[PDB]
Design a binder for these strands. Structure first.
Lengths: 94, 100, 106
DNA sequence: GACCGGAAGGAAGGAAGTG
DNA sequence: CACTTCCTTCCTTCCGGTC
C-alpha cells in the first residue's frame, strides 16, 4: 500500500502543497506548516476519517527505531530523513 | 525448549537465550512461573534478526509476534512490568501435542 | 440474502467460503457472524467464535482468527471474496468468483 | 499543546508445510 | 491445489507520561 514516509515525499516534491508541508534546507530536513491538513489527506487516502496528527506522529516515531527519519529537536513539526540510517539498511555489515 | 525435536520459532529462540545467564544483559527470568523480562529489548530483536537473516528486526515487529501468542496461549503479558512476558507451560504443551 | 443462498445450498449439495455461508444460512449464528448489505458484504461480530467453530468442523485445534483471516486473504486473488476497507472483521463475497468455482465457463 | 514510547490488534502478503 | 502455520512489515488506536 501507500506507506506514510512515501506519501510525505509525494507532497514535499509538489511545491504547490507548501501550505501543509515543505523543506527547510539543512540536509533532507522538512517541516509540516499545517499539521492537521497533512493528517487530513493521509486520512482520506486510507479511508480514515479519524486520522489526526497524534495518530500520524506515532507512525513517524516508529521510523526513529526503523532508522528511516529522525525528529529535529525544538523545531515544531520538524522531521529530518537520515541518509546514513537509510544507507546502513541497504548496505548492512552484520 | 530442548523437547522441540521448519525454522526456529520466536517463543523457542527466547528459551535458548533464557537458559544461558551469559545473555542476562538483554534477557533474564523474573521469579518463578516463567515470568521473564527483556533488559535490552533492542539487543534481543537484533539477534532474532541474526537468527532469521532479517537485519531490519526491531522490538515493534518482534513484540507484534509475541502478541500473536495470546490466542496460541504460548505466553502472556505481565501488565505491571515493562518489557515483561510470562510463558504458559500448558500453552506450549497444547502447541506440541494438541488434543481435540 | 435468499438469492446468495442459491449458490451456498447448491454446493452444500469442505472449503471455508462454503462454511461461512453455512453460518449465514438462517440465523442464531448472528451472535458471531451476519450480513451488512445483501450485495455480499458481511461482518464477524465474534471473530474468535467463527474461528473456534471452523477449526472444529475441519477437526484441527489451535484455529484462531489470524489463521482463518489469512485463509480469506488468499480468496482475494482467486476472486471468491474481497475486503471491505476500514471495517473491523468485514468481508464481501464475489458472486462471479463463486460462479467459476461451481460452474466452469471459459 | 507538542512530544515520547508502550501496548493491543488489524490487515497485507511472503514462505514453507499439509495431506 | 486449499488451506494452515508463523510470522514480517506497517501501521491505527489508545493510553499515561514529560516538557
Amino acid at each position: 500500500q501507500i506507506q506514510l514516509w512515501q506519501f510525505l515525499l509525494e507532497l514535499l516534491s509538489d511545491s504547490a502543497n507548501a501550505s501543509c508541508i515543505t523543506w527547510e534546507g539543512t540536509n533532507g530536513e522538512f517541516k509540516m506548516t499545517d499539521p492537521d491538513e497533512v493528517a487530513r489527506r493521509w486520512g482520506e487516502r486510507k479511508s480514515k476519517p479519524n486520522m489526526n496528527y497524534d495518530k500520524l506522529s506515532r507512525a513517524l516515531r516508529y521510523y526513529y527505531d526503523k532508522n528511516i527519519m529522525t525528529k529535529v529537536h525544538g523545531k515544531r513539526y520538524a522531521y529530518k530523513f537520515d541518509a546514513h540510517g537509510i544507507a546502513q539498511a541497504l548496505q548492512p555489515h552484520p
